[PDB]
Amino acid sequence: GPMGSNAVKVRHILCEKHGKIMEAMEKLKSGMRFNEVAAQYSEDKARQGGDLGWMTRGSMVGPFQEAAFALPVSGMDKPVFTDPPVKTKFGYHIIMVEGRK
Numbered sequence: 001g002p003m004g005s006n007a008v009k010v011r012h013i014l015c016e017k018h019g020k021i022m023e024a025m026e027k028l029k030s031g032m033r034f035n036e037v038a039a040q041y042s043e044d045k046a047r048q049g050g051d052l053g054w055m056t057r058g059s060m061v062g063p064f065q066e067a068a069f070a071l072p073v074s075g076m077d078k079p080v081f082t083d084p085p086v087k088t089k090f091g092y093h094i095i096m097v098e099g100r101k
């Protein structure tokens, strides 16, 4: 149905360990740009600055999807990200959304 046409352009920092995702969160809260935090800490898409690109509804793991569609579009100078980090079967994610359909 129509909700399957919904999508987000999404960027994340993924860390297996809670301690490490919290380190990443401290860097974001210090002002570090999201892509730079992802380069330092993310275990997925690190070389893309955490960018997952466009992801349609149904393509993301449940807790990640619910968190992502709840975030407004933001940019890396004025980010709006998940706090606290979101736990999935992959680990802990910090997410921001750069586009919405």
Ligand code: NA
Residues within 6 Å of the ligand: 016, 017, 018, 019
């Ligand atoms: Na842990």
Ligand code: NA
Residues within 6 Å of the ligand: 061, 062, 063, 087, 088, 089, 090
């Ligand atoms: Na999960």
